[PDB]
Scaffold this active site. Structure first.
Site, mmCIF file in Angstrom:
data_model
loop_
_atom_site.group_PDB
_atom_site.id
_atom_site.type_symbol
_atom_site.label_atom_id
_atom_site.label_comp_id
_atom_site.label_asym_id
_atom_site.label_seq_id
_atom_site.Cartn_x
_atom_site.Cartn_y
_atom_site.Cartn_z
ATOM 1 N N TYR A 122 -7.491 13.283 -1.404
ATOM 2 C CA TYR A 122 -7.192 12.577 -0.165
ATOM 3 C C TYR A 122 -6.749 13.584 0.885
ATOM 4 O O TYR A 122 -5.926 14.458 0.596
ATOM 5 C CB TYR A 122 -6.105 11.522 -0.398
ATOM 6 C CG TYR A 122 -5.623 10.811 0.843
ATOM 7 C CD1 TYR A 122 -6.387 9.817 1.440
ATOM 8 C CD2 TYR A 122 -4.391 11.118 1.408
ATOM 9 C CE1 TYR A 122 -5.944 9.161 2.568
ATOM 10 C CE2 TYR A 122 -3.943 10.467 2.537
ATOM 11 C CZ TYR A 122 -4.723 9.490 3.114
ATOM 12 O OH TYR A 122 -4.279 8.838 4.240
ATOM 13 N N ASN B 68 0.833 -1.192 0.000
ATOM 14 C CA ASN B 68 0.000 0.000 0.000
ATOM 15 C C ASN B 68 0.871 1.247 0.000
ATOM 16 O O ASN B 68 1.880 1.311 0.709
ATOM 17 C CB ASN B 68 -0.928 0.011 1.213
ATOM 18 C CG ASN B 68 -2.122 0.917 1.024
ATOM 19 O OD1 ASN B 68 -2.504 1.235 -0.103
ATOM 20 N ND2 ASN B 68 -2.724 1.334 2.129
ATOM 21 N N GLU C 157 -10.449 10.480 7.726
ATOM 22 C CA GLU C 157 -9.668 10.337 6.503
ATOM 23 C C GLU C 157 -10.641 10.287 5.333
ATOM 24 O O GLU C 157 -11.457 9.364 5.247
ATOM 25 C CB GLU C 157 -8.817 9.066 6.564
ATOM 26 C CG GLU C 157 -7.816 8.890 5.439
ATOM 27 C CD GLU C 157 -7.193 7.505 5.437
ATOM 28 O OE1 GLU C 157 -7.901 6.536 5.788
ATOM 29 O OE2 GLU C 157 -5.998 7.380 5.095
ATOM 30 N N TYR D 73 -11.902 10.799 1.090
ATOM 31 C CA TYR D 73 -11.571 10.559 -0.306
ATOM 32 C C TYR D 73 -12.593 11.223 -1.218
ATOM 33 O O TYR D 73 -13.765 11.377 -0.862
ATOM 34 C CB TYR D 73 -11.543 9.060 -0.643
ATOM 35 C CG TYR D 73 -10.417 8.261 -0.032
ATOM 36 C CD1 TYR D 73 -10.490 7.807 1.277
ATOM 37 C CD2 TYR D 73 -9.297 7.924 -0.779
ATOM 38 C CE1 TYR D 73 -9.465 7.058 1.834
ATOM 39 C CE2 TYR D 73 -8.267 7.175 -0.230
ATOM 40 C CZ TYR D 73 -8.357 6.744 1.077
ATOM 41 O OH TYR D 73 -7.338 6.001 1.631
ATOM 42 N N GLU E 266 -3.039 6.375 -5.036
ATOM 43 C CA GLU E 266 -2.950 5.266 -4.100
ATOM 44 C C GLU E 266 -3.053 3.951 -4.860
ATOM 45 O O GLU E 266 -3.886 3.807 -5.761
ATOM 46 C CB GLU E 266 -4.048 5.327 -3.032
ATOM 47 C CG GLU E 266 -4.093 4.091 -2.132
ATOM 48 C CD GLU E 266 -5.087 4.214 -0.996
ATOM 49 O OE1 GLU E 266 -5.770 5.256 -0.906
ATOM 50 O OE2 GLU E 266 -5.185 3.266 -0.188
#
Length: 186
Positions: free
Chosen positions: A71, A37, A80, A82, A173
């Protein structure tokens, strides 16, 4: 009277190789091979709910799971978020909350939870706010994400971002994939 990007974002967990390039201005590139990741992008050190993020992804070629997304983080509470404009072989989803239309596209609204996960506060338990486009957005052109539309949409669904604003980037990502991308953010 334009405050362009000031923050270079580059995180990996060590899996595979991630060749991330801090380029001239608000332009970055990244080629990755067989990775774990990672999150790479350019943005602003302090996000804004009223910022319109512009970008042009000249290349977004994920071979597998990769995201081309806005992000960012907030504190108090720890969240968090998106705004996924395009992806590879996997479309991120969660608890459906509704839809929002912005910048020519209709985005699905999802909430998820992270459990004992890395954050800007360390290992924590926190909520993820998602706006995921129903169709992949075309790249290679100048695109804008009018983030104040998504913030209001999230708020109308009981999704309230925190009061302290950490970074906010147009990121690439990927997870368990290879690929390349080239994005300019301003």
């Amino acid at each position: 009277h334009h405050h362009a990007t000031d923050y270079w974002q580059n995180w990996t967990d060590g899996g595979g190789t991630v060749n991330a390039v801090n380029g001239s201005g608000g332009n970055y590139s990244v080629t990755w091979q067989n990775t774990g990741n990672f999150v790479v992008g350019k943005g602003w050190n302090v996000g804004s709910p009223n910022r319109t993020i512009n970008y042009n992804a000249g290349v977004f070629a994920p071979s597998g799971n990769g995201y081309l997304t806005l992000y960012g983080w907030t504190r108090n509470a720890l969240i968090e978020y998106y705004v996924v404009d395009s992806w590879g072989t996997y479309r991120p989803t969660g608890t459906f909350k509704g839809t929002v239309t912005s910048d020519g596209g209709t985005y699905d609204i999802y909430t998820t939870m992270r459990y004992n996960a890395p954050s800007i506060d360390g290992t924590q338990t926190f909520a993820q706010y998602w706006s995921v486009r129903q169709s992949k957005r075309a790249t290679g052109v100048n695109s804008a994400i009018t983030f104040s539309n998504h913030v209001n949409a999230w708020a109308s669904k009981g999704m309230n971002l925190g009061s302290s604003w950490s970074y906010q980037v147009l990121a690439t990502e990927g997870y368990q994939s290879s690929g390349s991308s080239n994005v300019t953010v301003w």
